[PDB]
Structure 1
Amino acid sequence: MVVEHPEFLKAGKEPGLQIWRVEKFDLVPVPTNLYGDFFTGDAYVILKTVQLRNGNLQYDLHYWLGNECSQDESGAAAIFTVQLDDYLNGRAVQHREVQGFESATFLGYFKSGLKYKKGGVASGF
């Protein structure tokens, strides 16, 4: 574990919310204004950094999987999520999120509402 990918260094530094979309075997940071918008044919990865009472941090890894997406993107979403958890010293609990069947907490992150849409980047195969 000596990963030096641009997005990894920026991740988990301060409290907030970070989103990346799986774009042909690689992560790309979604614009902050487009948060809460997901293409049904793609796989995404989210990380909720919450501040704690002791001064330390808390990380919650969520990966949203599209309905009409491909296997490469669905798989990659699981792979990156594990590599991050390890990058944060195994201090995060992962969450599997499906389209339509979102969890209790996952729905709570978006204070502007969750909005799906048709489309998405092509597969890497």
Structure 2
Amino acid sequence: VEHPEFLKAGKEPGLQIWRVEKFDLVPVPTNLYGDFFTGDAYVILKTVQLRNGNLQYDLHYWLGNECSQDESGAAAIFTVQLDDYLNGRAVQHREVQGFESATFLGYFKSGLKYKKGGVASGFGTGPFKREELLDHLEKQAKEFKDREDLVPYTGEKRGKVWVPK
């Protein structure tokens, strides 16, 4: 799980932020921290130094009100993947715009601004008589021929066969 951002995630104490761009996890320029597109989903990692020398992790995925389903779903999966690269030690948090945790809001000293837009998605009669009805149903018999375009199933084993060695 070799992603160049995963190598960086959670090394030093501090605040890392990525945006979901087209099924990818992309670093957000550090100048732009705190300004979220509300058409987008973000992944945020707070690394705090414990007094025991260990690193404390808090993994926030932030769903803009207009983010497309691929980006919010990607956000959450990346959150799980990142926790899992960090030995399951992160606490995972779902942050929806307008509903953020005080904790998450605490990371932005000047304070987080929203703003519109973002990156495009990675997706591309009378009495009922049955004999009248039932007649229709059995009235299509010689009508439907088979499909003629197909590759019938032989049972062909195309792959190499793993020997129980």
TM (normalized to structure 2)?
0.74
In the TM superposition, 1:1-125 aligns within 5 A as 3-125=1-123
Q: 1:9-43 CA deviation, whole Å, 9 max, x = no partner? A: 01100100000000000011001111000000000
How far apart are the structure 2 equivalents of 1:52 and 1:25?
Answer: 33
Between the aligned residues of both structures, percent identity stands at: 100
Larger radius of gyration: 2
CA deviation after TM superposition for structure 1 residue 109, in Å: 0.6
Q: 2:31 aligns to what SS in structure 1? A: helix
CA deviation after TM superposition for structure 1 residue 70, in Å: 0.6
Q: 1:37 aligns to what SS in structure 2? A: coil
How far apart are the structure 2 equivalents of 1:112 and 1:123?
Answer: 30
Q: 1:20-79 CA deviation, whole Å, 9 max, x = no partner? A: 000000011001111000000000000000011111110000010010111000100000
Q: 1:72-123 CA deviation, whole Å, 9 max, x = no partner? A: 0010000000000000000111001000010120010101211000000001
Give ranges in structure 1 of 5+ residues lacking alignment. Answer: none
Q: 1:117 aligns to what SS in structure 2? A: coil
Q: Which has the higher strand share?
A: 1
Q: 2:12 aligns to what SS in structure 1? A: coil
How far apart are the structure 1 equivalents of 2:83 and 2:27?
Answer: 18
How far apart are the structure 1 equivalents of 2:53 and 2:72?
Answer: 35
After superposition, the CA RMSD in angstroms is 0.5
Q: 2:106 aligns to what SS in structure 1? A: helix
TM (normalized to structure 1)?
0.97
**Moved >4 Å (runs of 4+):** none
Question: RCO higher in 1 or 2 (8 Å CA, sep ≥ 6)?
Answer: 1
Residue correspondences, number? 123
How far apart are the structure 2 equivalents of 1:59 and 1:9?
Answer: 15
